[PDB]
Amino acid sequence: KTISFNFNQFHQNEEQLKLQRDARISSNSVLELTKVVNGVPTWNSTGRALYAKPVQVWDSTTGNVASFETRFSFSIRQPFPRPHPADGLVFFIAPPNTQTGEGGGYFGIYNPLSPYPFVAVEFDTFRNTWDPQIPHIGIDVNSVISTKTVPFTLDNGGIANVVIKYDASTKILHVVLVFPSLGTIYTIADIVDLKQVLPESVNVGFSAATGDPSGKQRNATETHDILSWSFSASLPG
Amino acid sequence: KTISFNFNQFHQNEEQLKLQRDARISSNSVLELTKVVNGVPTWNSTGRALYAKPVQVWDSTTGNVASFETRFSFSIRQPFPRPHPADGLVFFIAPPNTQTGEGGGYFGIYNPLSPYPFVAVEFDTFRNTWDPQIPHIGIDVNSVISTKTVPFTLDNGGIANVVIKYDASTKILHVVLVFPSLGTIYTIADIVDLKQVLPESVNVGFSAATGDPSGKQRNATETHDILSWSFSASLPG
Ligand SMILES: *[C@@H]1O[C@H](CO)[C@@H](O[C@@H]2O[C@H](CO)[C@@H](O)[C@H](O)[C@H]2NC(C)=O)[C@H](O[C@@H]2O[C@@H](C)[C@@H](O)[C@@H](O)[C@@H]2O)[C@H]1NC(C)=O
Ligand SMILES: *[C@@H]1O[C@H](CO)[C@@H](O[C@@H]2O[C@H](CO)[C@@H](O)[C@H](O)[C@H]2NC(C)=O)[C@H](O[C@@H]2O[C@@H](C)[C@@H](O)[C@@H](O)[C@@H]2O)[C@H]1NC(C)=O
Ligand SMILES: *[C@@H]1O[C@H](CO)[C@@H](O[C@@H]2O[C@H](CO)[C@@H](O)[C@H](O)[C@H]2NC(C)=O)[C@H](O[C@@H]2O[C@@H](C)[C@@H](O)[C@@H](O)[C@@H]2O)[C@H]1NC(C)=O
Ligand SMILES: *[C@@H]1O[C@H](CO)[C@@H](O[C@@H]2O[C@H](CO)[C@@H](O)[C@H](O)[C@H]2NC(C)=O)[C@H](O[C@@H]2O[C@@H](C)[C@@H](O)[C@@H](O)[C@@H]2O)[C@H]1NC(C)=O
Ligand SMILES: CC(=O)N[C@@H]1[C@@H](O)[C@@H](O)[C@@H](CO)O[C@@H]1O
Ligand SMILES: CC(=O)N[C@@H]1[C@@H](O)[C@@H](O)[C@@H](CO)O[C@@H]1O
Ligand SMILES: [Ca+2]
Ligand SMILES: [Ca+2]
Ligand SMILES: [Mn+2]
Ligand SMILES: [Mn+2]
């Protein structure tokens, strides 16, 4: 089977999306994952957006795994440089019907009290105890402590283009990050066996989070906007 | 044992380069792999450019393999759309002291008579009997019949940015192609075991070719210019 969707922009009450927590669509078409009031990003915010319908990444009958490609544009504006912006956004794949997890450094996808598996590509802006210098792109498998990491310089408020591609034959998950205004290109890849970590049917989407209250810093925040998003998956068997 | 060089521009008679066949550096600093006379690309042309010093991709004593990253910008101008431009350019790695191979669809790196091993990333503009729709990026190992392929749309005469990265721990060779003027991004990756195909010391460089006379089409041509090039390899030990 081949499934695919495209979003050139977003409208209020998009029937193909599942918004959770602080996630919402602005009047001028952008998907704001985290809370922003009067043009100002708030702390203690967590939001997710999932594609309404589940997609099948693999079939147990034939044992075949799907190959997929996803592209999206996001923007992170960091109004308060000091002490430190937080926390970042991620593109992720998880079992269907999950609830928003812990916020802060966990981006809203990890729940210590009852963990569910997931594969995620993160754009980390805050340095937790388990993180290397930030910002950085990271490939996460069942944990927020990345298997592979690469540093990148953020184009504050600028637009970022991301291409995530997964080839089932080689099991290579490669992501590309581009800031057209700066002409900078960042690349990272790692081997991930989807069949080994996720169930046959999953949900795909984004999740982000701002500074957690425990950090005692209202300045630890930023925006996490998704401007556009296309997804395509192919399962031969 | 880290090695790296950077050519932000090309000078007449570069002491660090080895030009072969039709390859030459224009007065305005660009590296023209194939022949172009009076601003017009000729057919029956083949040229290569190798970094003068050999680089060590792996060490037999420790068994360790090098990781490397290379970035470059090229431009392909296609003056004659009909009947078909040809043939393309490639970035490649081969044993030191090799001679230009067959031209045409072989880009000047393959020699049926006496083949030598090589790993190359191709940007193919002509569709040979062994090729899929063109243009396409392709990863070649010891042969011009690609292991992995991805189609791309050329920005005629525009500038292209390429990022080729090889991670020895995962053996993943991933390349990224970007046409800044169109904002388009193309990505491809595959697993290649350098230690298994190439000798300890190799040469890195470019090779390109225009329409072969046997095709009986003088229009089967285009330019193959390299604007800038940086390389870097880290061999632990
Ligand atoms: C949180 O962000 C605020 C806005 O960026 C910081 O205040 C700004 O601090 C600038 C330099 O310290 C100063 O030039 C600006 O006028 C001021 N902006 C306003 C109107 O708040 C804030 O910095 C703290 O608060 C200011 C008022 C001073 O007390 C500074 O010494 C403080 O660092 C940031 N707070 C934190 C926790 O960093
Ligand atoms: C961070 O956001 C939380 C919700 O997104 C806040 O808790 C919410 O507080 C509301 C009170 O105004 C209450 O109706 C909601 O049920 C509750 N949500 C849940 C289930 O936690 C949380 O802090 C709360 O609100 C402040 C004003 C105090 O009333 C606290 O005691 C609450 O826990 C926010 N964290 C902070 C430190 O502001
Ligand atoms: C394609 O380019 C070739 C050069 O790499 C031409 O081959 C000829 O090679 C000879 C020895 O290697 C050399 O003396 C010639 O100068 C050169 N071509 C000439 C005459 O300039 C080849 O030219 C054709 O083939 C040669 C053997 C001669 O018969 C020429 O008259 C032919 O044009 C070029 N092919 C074509 C079809 O243009
Ligand atoms: C080889 O490239 C040439 C330049 O692009 C083509 O000639 C051009 O063809 C145009 C129509 O395709 C015509 O309007 C132009 O006047 C002409 N310009 C030149 C430089 O001659 C050429 O096209 C064929 O050959 C020429 C000589 C004409 O007879 C055209 O009508 C033919 O289509 C290209 N050759 C091929 C195989 O198309
Ligand atoms: C574990 C955890 O969520 N840690 C958070 C961190 O991610 C960030 O939100 C910070 C902001 O000041 O507050 C805490 O340290
Ligand atoms: C095998 C070979 O070199 N084939 C070439 C092809 O690569 C291209 O140059 C074409 C142009 O007319 O002429 C021939 O078919
Ligand atoms: Ca973090
Ligand atoms: Ca070809
Ligand atoms: Mn991280
Ligand atoms: Mn090819």
Q: Is A218 in the pocket of ligand 2 (CB under 6 A)?
A: no
In degrees, to the nearest 5, what angle opens at C-alpha A181 toward C-alphas A177 and A186? 20
Which residues, 6+ apart, have CB-to-CB distance to A189 below 8 Å?
A148, A172, A173, A174, A175, B165, B167, B170, B172, B174, B189
Minimal-distance CA residue of chain A relative to B182: A180
Helix (H) or strand (E) holding B160: strand B160-167
Which 8-state DSSP code applies to residue A4?
E
Chain B: which residues have CB within 8 Å of chain A? 71, 148, 161, 163, 165, 167, 170, 172, 174, 176, 178, 180, 183, 185, 187, 189-191
Which 8-state DSSP code applies to residue B61?
T
Which 8-state DSSP code applies to residue B65?
B
Instruction: Quote the tokens at residue B4.
Output: 């790296």
Q: Distance of CA B99 to CAs A123, B49, B95, B185, B210, Å?
A: 46, 11, 10, 34, 18
Taking the C-alpha atoms of residue A146 and residue A107, their distance in angstroms, rounded to an integer, is 13
Taking the C-alpha atoms of residue A119 and residue A173, their distance in angstroms, rounded to an integer, is 10
In CATH, what number is assigned to the domain containing residue B103?
Answer: 2.60.120.200
Q: Residue A16 class from Cβ within 10 Å (0-12 exposed, 13-18 middle, 19+ buried)?
A: exposed
Q: What is the DSSP string of B201-222?
A: EEEEEEEEEE--GGG--TT---
CB A221 within 8 A of CB A43: yes
Which 8-state DSSP code applies to residue B194?
H
Handedness of CA A186, B63, B149, B100 (dihedral sign): positive
Which of B172, B173, B228 is the best mutation test for A, with the most CBs of A within 10 A? B172
3-state secondary structure of B122: strand
Tell me how crowded residue A54 is: count the other CB atoms within 10 A of its CB.
17
Amino acid at position A28, single letter = N
Q: Is B46 in the pocket of ligand 3 (CB under 6 A)?
A: no
Helix (H) or strand (E) holding B138: strand B136-141
Q: Is B96 in the pocket of ligand 4 (CB under 6 A)?
A: no
Taking the C-alpha atoms of residue A166 and residue A74, their distance in angstroms, rounded to an integer, is 20
Ramachandran bin of A161, using left for φ above 0, alpha for ψ from -120 to 50, beta for the remaining angles = beta
Question: Do residue B176 and residue A176 have CB atoms under 8 angstroms apart?
Answer: yes
* Smallest-distance ligand from the CA of A132: 9
Start-end of H helices in B140-207? 194-197
Q: Which of A174, A178, A180 sits opposite B174 (nearest CB)?
A: A174
Question: Do residue A170 and residue B190 have CB atoms under 8 angstroms apart?
Answer: yes
Taking the C-alpha atoms of residue B183 and residue A108, their distance in angstroms, rounded to an integer, is 31
Which of B159, B161, B174 is the best mutation test for A, with the most CBs of A within 10 A? B174
| Distance from the alpha carbon of residue B20 to the mean position of ligand 7, in angstroms | 50
Minimal-distance CA residue of chain B relative to A69: B187
Q: Which of B71, B163, B187 sits opposite A165 (nearest CB)?
A: B187
Q: Which of B163, B187, B191 sits opposite A163 (nearest CB)?
A: B187
Taking the C-alpha atoms of residue A100 and residue A91, their distance in angstroms, rounded to an integer, is 14
How many structural domains comprise chain B? 1
Tell me which residue range forms the domain holding A62: 1-237
3-state secondary structure of A75: strand
First vs last C-alpha separation in chain B:
6
Chain A: which residues have CB within 8 Å of chain B? 71, 161, 163, 165, 167, 170, 172, 174, 176, 178, 180, 183, 185, 187, 189-191
CB B167 within 8 A of CB B190: no
Q: What is the DSSP string of A76-104?
A: ---S--SS---EEEEEEEE-SS----B-G
Which residues, 6+ apart, have CB-to-CB distance to A131 below 8 Å?
A105, A124
Taking the C-alpha atoms of residue A124 and residue A134, their distance in angstroms, rounded to an integer, is 7
Instruction: Choose among A177, A172, A171: nearest CA to A73.
Output: A177
Question: Do residue B180 and residue A185 have CB atoms under 8 angstroms apart?
Answer: no
Minimal-distance CA residue of chain B relative to A169: B190
Q: What is the DSSP string of B35-55?
A: -EETTEE-SS-EEEEEESS-E
Q: This structure's resolution (angstroms)?
A: 2.7
| Distance from the alpha carbon of residue A199 to the mean position of ligand 7, in angstroms | 27
CA of A46, closest CA in chain B: separation in Å?
A: 30
3-state secondary structure of B11: coil
Closest protein CA for atom 4 of ligand 4: B80
Instruction: Quote the tokens at residue A94.
Output: 């998880």
Q: Which residues of A touch B189 (CB under 8 A)?
A: 165, 167, 170, 172, 174, 189
B212: preceding bond cis by omega (within 30 degrees): no
Instruction: Choose among A21, A137, A142, A127: nearest CA to A83.
Output: A127
R_g of chain B, CA atoms, integer Å: 17
Minimal-distance CA residue of chain B relative to A175: B187
Instruction: Quote the tokens at residue B232.
Output: 């870097």
Taking the C-alpha atoms of residue B95 and residue B103, their distance in angstroms, rounded to an integer, is 19
CB A204 within 8 A of CB A71: no
3-state secondary structure of A197: helix
CB B116 within 8 A of CB B95: yes
3-state SS record for A97-126: CCCCCECHHHCCCECCCCCCCCEEEEEECC
Q: What is the DSSP string of A140-186?
A: EESSSS-SEEEE----TT--EEEEEEEETTTTEEEEEEEETTTTEEE
Which 8-state DSSP code applies to residue A9?
S
Instruction: Quote the tokens at residue A189.
Output: 């890849």
Q: Residue A79 class from Cβ within 10 Å (0-12 exposed, 13-18 middle, 19+ buried)?
A: middle
3-state secondary structure of B59: coil
Q: Distance of CA B157 to CAs A181, B79, B225, Å?
A: 21, 9, 10
CB A21 within 8 A of CB A46: yes
Question: Do residue B174 and residue A170 have CB atoms under 8 angstroms apart?
Answer: no
Tokens 């970007």, residue?
B178
Q: Residue A15 class from Cβ within 10 Å (0-12 exposed, 13-18 middle, 19+ buried)?
A: exposed
Which 8-state DSSP code applies to residue B196?
H
Mutate to test the pocket of ligand 2, among A21, A34, A35, A44 (most ligand atoms within 8 A of CB): A44
Tell me how crowded residue B129 is: count the other CB atoms within 10 A of its CB.
6
Q: Is B216 in the pocket of ligand 4 (CB under 6 A)?
A: no
CB A175 within 8 A of CB A149: no
Which residues, 6+ apart, have CB-to-CB distance to A45 below 8 Å?
A22, A34, A35, A103, A209, A210, A221
Q: What are phi and psi of A214, to 5 degrees?
A: -55, -25
CB B72 within 8 A of CB B229: yes
Q: What share of chain B is helix, strand, coil (3-state, %, to 5)?
A: 5, 45, 50
Taking the C-alpha atoms of residue B183 and residue B179, their distance in angstroms, rounded to an integer, is 6
Q: What are phi and psi of A124, to 5 degrees?
A: -85, 125
Helix (H) or strand (E) holding B188: strand B184-191
CB B200 within 8 A of CB B56: yes
| Distance from the alpha carbon of residue A44 to the mean position of ligand 2, in angstroms | 9
Instruction: Choose among A31, A225, A207: nearest CA to A108.
Output: A207
Taking the C-alpha atoms of residue A224 and residue A29, their distance in angstroms, rounded to an integer, is 14
Instruction: Quote the tokens at residue A75.
Output: 């923007």
Q: Is B116 in the pocket of ligand 4 (CB under 6 A)?
A: no
